[PDB]
Structure of Serine hydroxymethyltransferase:
Amino acid sequence: QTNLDFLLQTDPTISGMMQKELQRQREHLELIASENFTSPAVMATQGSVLTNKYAEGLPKKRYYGGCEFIDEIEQVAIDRAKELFGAASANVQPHSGAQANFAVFLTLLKPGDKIMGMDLSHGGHLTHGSPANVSGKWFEAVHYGVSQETEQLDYDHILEVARQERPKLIICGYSAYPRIINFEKFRAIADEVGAYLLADIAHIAGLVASGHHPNPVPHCDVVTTTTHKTLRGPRGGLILTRDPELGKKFNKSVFPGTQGGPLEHVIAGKAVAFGEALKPEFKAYSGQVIANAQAMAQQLQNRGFKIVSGGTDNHLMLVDLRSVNLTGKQADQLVSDVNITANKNTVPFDPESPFVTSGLRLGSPAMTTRGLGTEDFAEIANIIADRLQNPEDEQVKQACVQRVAALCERFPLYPHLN
Amino acid sequence: QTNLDFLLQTDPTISGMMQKELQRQREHLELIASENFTSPAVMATQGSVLTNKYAEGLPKKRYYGGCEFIDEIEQVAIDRAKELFGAASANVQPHSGAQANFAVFLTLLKPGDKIMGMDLSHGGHLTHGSPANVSGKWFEAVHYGVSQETEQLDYDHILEVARQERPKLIICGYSAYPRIINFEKFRAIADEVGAYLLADIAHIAGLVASGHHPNPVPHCDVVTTTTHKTLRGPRGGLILTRDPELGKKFNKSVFPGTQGGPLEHVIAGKAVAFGEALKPEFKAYSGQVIANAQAMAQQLQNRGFKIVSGGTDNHLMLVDLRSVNLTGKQADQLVSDVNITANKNTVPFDPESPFVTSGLRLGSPAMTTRGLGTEDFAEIANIIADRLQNPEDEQVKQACVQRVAALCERFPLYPHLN
Ligand SMILES: Cc1ncc(COP(=O)(O)O)c(CN[C@@H](CO)C(=O)O)c1O
Ligand SMILES: Cc1ncc(COP(=O)(O)O)c(CN[C@@H](CO)C(=O)O)c1O
């Protein structure tokens, strides 16, 4: 008798909906740039009895009895994070990227202090100063964007904004930026205006880990990330720093500053995911992720689409939809209609509201995990192009649905499960 | 081939430490009052592919494609929460109790506003105004305590403190309070000083759900809880309110106010746990939890120990350790030494610091889940009494270890697993 057998017996409603979600993951092209398919091993840790343990504090410094094994697991997670990212300090307890970022803010700032991040419409995150997020509600958020000419960062301009605004904290790292970030230049800029420097590498963490993107850790005061995007782990957050005394302060801000008990089953999954990312296979995967994203971006360009910045250095791209006279909201719907899962996104200098947008964000990590190569991603580009160019055409619609089905059949997902 | 097989094959280190943690849970008396043993069904949801989905927003109002099944699951969680607690609104996304409470604060307060909760040393939570927590760092926290005479709440005195202090938010609900809370009197007090009223029922949520403790939902502005203590679910948080317009505001404060993507695998587990708590078996379990706690408290009293307040109405108790000339820190260690897992706790008006304390907190939920009855809890009381009364006696130590082993053998934990 298995845990899944108990679920079927005791909650057939939830059991059935879970089976539908597995079918759904199998039978769609998952192109949301922040998604991935985590391993069977990771999922086993999340399904474990580790959920039952209260473990406030840190390994060997807990507020409860009985943490001897939890301490061993969390210490493996910490040690593998420090190995993977070349970091002197790591806190593996943040429940999410949002909570990792909040703990950093609690450490470095007081309410009302000024933060400077990327414009949300240009690729910055809600937690980097959106007025609907605590980061913009309780702090004074100012923004930099990309160049209207190159559609990428102009470091001279960023320095000019920093000098004018005098932020206490500068944030780099983004949700929708397709080029390499120069952390050395961010350090120069922070040093010049006396700001703290945070790199939020949630999206690119697996590329950092694999050596396919420069590492912010030696240069920044602190680095946050999620564990579940290109790092292909469970959902959760992570705080890294080159400064182990500062790391002690961040620990206090995670607990007792912002969280209670950590999710030790998730932390076991973080350990597992970090161990997988230490393997040579993961370096190859991460190279393939970028090759695949570039292939999809190039083929979209071949089909007449504008890619913001003219291409990509990483796992993602923004498709500007003027060439096809669609809003992001419309394009997102139209691709959902042919079993492609993405999300809309504002482009730099978007004429439309964020609830409408002019862009579609696409990424390669999830389908790269299923085994697709560059020519398979060129085929994905062609399916998307076909659908967006001929949105009223029913025969194109069904061709797209059939081409998606072929890709999904070729590249099974979790074939041992039902 | 199973997910656990993949874990063993790919990460024997983590696999082995996980197996040790299962053995540990089996072979200790787990008396931490905030712990439980969640079901195989719940653990199956946590181990599922639902970890792979980004689902910012709410059911049918998401910021990503592909949430059709996630929406069905989260809507089941919501509907079962509203059923179980008789609530007009529920948000099942908070990652933790701390995050549920923070989202409420973001909705109702601004930094600097005054909050009033139970003194931490008297049983209040870190998130109810500790100076080491955001709740006391960024808000003005004032406290009420219990009567030095009765060691329980004196509602006239609470009204006097509220009138003097004029808090914007009053918090009731506690981490270490062993008596019934009168939510009607808290409403009277809040109405009289024009304060919002939050009930944080994390500890007692399963007793509320089963009708063995009065329900705060009809009386309070908002109710927070965790899902993992007496509710016996996965680790996470929950926001309930009688006011569905207010509920919409709390939703915005969870996302995008304080969190990003929800943990949909955990949310599936919340649905399952709520479904289990709707069953008559859970009513019986919750009655047994209180009978068992009372049995342990009574037998400790028979062995000469002071129980704060003179007994318990719920799942927990605080043992005052003056009768045995020990600190909480010492008592906690001494019981760990005989395979009993608890935690130290300050008593009301404790002469010692919170890092030392004069108290041991004990609770019945976890061992009640394993099947123990009242006479078994009287035996637990006798083992603890023996150890604390004779801390230097090696023969008593081994008798205690052997008596713990007998209890654990009689009442197997998750016997289908290895
Ligand atoms: C009333 C209340 N509200 C909130 C929380 C926080 O829950 P979290 O651990 O899920 O953040 C707790 C946790 N309670 C833990 C201590 O943090 C305990 O062992 O008692 C609580 O007791
Ligand atoms: C840079 C950065 N930092 C933090 C977070 C928050 O992570 P969480 O969802 O775990 O809170 C995100 C999430 N990113 C989501 C949107 O929230 C996405 O689909 O892009 C992020 O991109």
Summary: The pocket of PLS (ligand 2) is lined by residues A 34, 96-98, 125, 127, 173-175, 200, 202-203, 226, 237; B 54, 56, 259-261 (CB under 6 Å). Residues 280-302 of chain A form the longest helix (23 residues). The first strand of chain A starts at residue 29 and ends at 30.
